[PDB]
Design a protein around this ligand. Structure first.
Ligand SMILES: CCCCCCCCCCCCCC(=O)SCCNC(=O)CCNC(=O)[C@H](O)C(C)(C)COP(=O)(O)OP(=O)(O)OC[C@H]1O[C@@H](n2cnc3c(N)ncnc32)[C@H](O)[C@@H]1OP(=O)(O)O
Ligand SMILES: Cc1c(CCOc2cccnc2-c2ccnc(N3CCNCC3)c2)c(C(=O)NCC(=O)O)nn1C
Ligand SMILES: [Cl-]
Ligand SMILES: [Cl-]
Ligand SMILES: [Cl-]
Ligand SMILES: [Cl-]
Ligand SMILES: [Cl-]
Ligand SMILES: [Cl-]
Ligand SMILES: [Cl-]
Ligand SMILES: [Cl-]
Ligand SMILES: [Cl-]
Ligand SMILES: [Cl-]
Ligand SMILES: [Cl-]
Ligand SMILES: [Cl-]
Ligand SMILES: [Cl-]
Length: 384
């Protein structure tokens, strides 16, 4: 079908471009020609600009997502982003409040739809372009398949265009026209009994309960003994270490110093970053963020508390040793499982460190940009 997406500046499902192509579908755009009127909504619905710095507006978004956002392929789990997490993810440097858009049902004054974007500098095939990073598209379950999502997309495109920005980046679990890369996800069990009780991990005659507990047990000693929580004094060094690491990839964000402080300085129950400092220099770093999933229907446990691999760089140890420490630090902060995508160098440690393959993949997309696609080991960016 793709009745909507084939009207947009994106590749068709069979399009394929070679390395000589790296440019927009539509160039020479003028801000003056962008529509000045908001898109029409059905009778009884209105646009609403959300202020995520206000606790009440932030809680309205939280409630919408907790009840209606992404579920796994089998409808066992639903993401449960915390309200503090949403604050962090949506207030990066130079964010625009008018790019946090909602749709209200006027008769009850309830939020039933949402989409957001934040500005970012993206390097694709060595070209750096100012882009919007789009996320948290959600329509209330009672209003699905009514073609409301295309309206949310067109309205946010209009508002991004009004700022003279014409490219975007986004990720989704569903296959749309057309991914630039596609990355399976993997899991590493930490709380073995909990994962068994909820029916996610499986046992058999070879892998009994006691053997599984033994298999996934980790030693409580760090390979990099001076790993410690990142502080404001570490921003400059993390900026240099991560910047140098990311330049090898075909797709990655170009961070400013201010952006490094926002995305990595630790926040309890949201973002964790550890560093190894030697001779005044940051030589190694580990980071992971907190994203629990609701266990739908379970009356014993509210959530599975997962840590998600963010950005990890090592110069004094092997990558296997570094990610072994990452798992231990997640365990020390009481996380139940450590999740990761097959981007950057992550695939090289999955077998040895006893990760298990998931049942789906995350696709990476660009809007109004045509280029060759690439394997996910060349992806160097993680969206939230
Ligand atoms: C330069 C600036 C540009 C900025 C804009 C950049 C583009 C941004 C695009 C968005 C980036 C978002 C990044 C994230 O947040 S990805 C996570 C998305 N959210 C969820 O999965 C939560 C649970 N599900 C829902 O809330 C609804 O099912 C959604 C809202 C997903 C669709 O609602 P509904 O189920 O009620 O359907 P409809 O009848 O209204 O509309 C049908 C059309 O929608 C196309 N569809 C389905 N799923 C997605 C999807 N995940 N990305 C893009 N398009 C999608 C579908 O192919 C069809 O098009 P076509 O096949 O007819 O052509
Ligand atoms: C789909 C899902 C998963 C599968 C894990 O999916 C990932 C694993 C690692 C990284 N990313 C993803 C992922 C998959 C689909 N969409 C996204 N998005 C949407 C678009 N914006 C960015 C984020 C991310 C889990 C889960 O892991 N439970 C813990 C356990 O089973 O152990 N719970 N649910 C609801
Ligand atoms: Cl085609
Ligand atoms: Cl103009
Ligand atoms: Cl309207
Ligand atoms: Cl709701
Ligand atoms: Cl559903
Ligand atoms: Cl239209
Ligand atoms: Cl068996
Ligand atoms: Cl400090
Ligand atoms: Cl719980
Ligand atoms: Cl390898
Ligand atoms: Cl596996
Ligand atoms: Cl490739
Ligand atoms: Cl790969």
């Amino acid at each position: 079908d793709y009745k909507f997406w084939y009207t947009q500046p994106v590749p068709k499902i069979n399009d394929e471009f070679n390395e000589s192509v790296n440019e927009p579908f539509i160039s020479d755009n003028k801000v003056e020609d962008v529509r000045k009127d908001e898109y029409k909504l059905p009778p009884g619905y209105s646009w609403y600009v959300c202020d995520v710095k206000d606790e009440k507006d932030r809680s309205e978004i939280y409630t919408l997502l907790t009840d209606n956002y992404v579920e796994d392929d089998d409808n066992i789990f639903r993401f449960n982003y915390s309200a503090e997490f949403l604050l962090w993810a949506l207030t990066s440097p130079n964010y625009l409040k008018t790019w946090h858009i909602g749709v209200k049902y006027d008769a009850s004054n309830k939020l039933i739809g949402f989409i957001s974007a934040i500005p970012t500098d993206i390097c694709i095939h060595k070209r750096t372009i100012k882009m919007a990073e789009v996320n948290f598209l959600c329509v209330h379950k009672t209003l699905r398949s009514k073609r409301l999502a295309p309206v949310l997309i067109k309205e946010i495109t209009r508002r991004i265009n009004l700022e003279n920005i014409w490219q975007a980046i986004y990720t989704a679990g569903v296959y749309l026209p057309k991914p630039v890369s596609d990355a399976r996800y993997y899991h590493r069990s930490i709380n073995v009994k909990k994962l068994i009780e909820i029916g996610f991990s499986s046992l058999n005659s070879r892998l009994t309960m006691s053997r599984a507990i033994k298999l996934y047990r980790v030693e409580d000693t760090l390979n990099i003994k001076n790993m410690r929580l990142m502080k404001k004094k570490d921003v400059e060094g993390v900026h240099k270490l991560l910047g140098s690491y990311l330049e090898q990839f075909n797709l990655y964000a170009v961070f400013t110093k201010e952006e490094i402080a926002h995305w990595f300085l630790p926040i309890e129950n949201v973002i964790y970053t550890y560093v190894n400092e030697e001779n005044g220099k940051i030589k190694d770093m580990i980071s992971f963020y907190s994203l629990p999933s609701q266990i739908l229907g379970n009356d014993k446990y509210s959530t599975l508390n997962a840590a998600y691999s963010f950005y990890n760089v090592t110069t004094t140890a092997t990558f296997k040793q570094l990610m072994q420490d990452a798992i231990l630090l997640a365990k020390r902060n009481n996380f139940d499982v450590f999740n990761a995508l097959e981007v950057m160098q992550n695939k090289s440690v999955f077998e040895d460190l006893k990760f298990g393959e998931g049942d789906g993949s995350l696709k990476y997309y660009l809007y109004n940009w045509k280029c060759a696609s690439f394997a996910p080991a060349h992806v160097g960016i993680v969206l939230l």
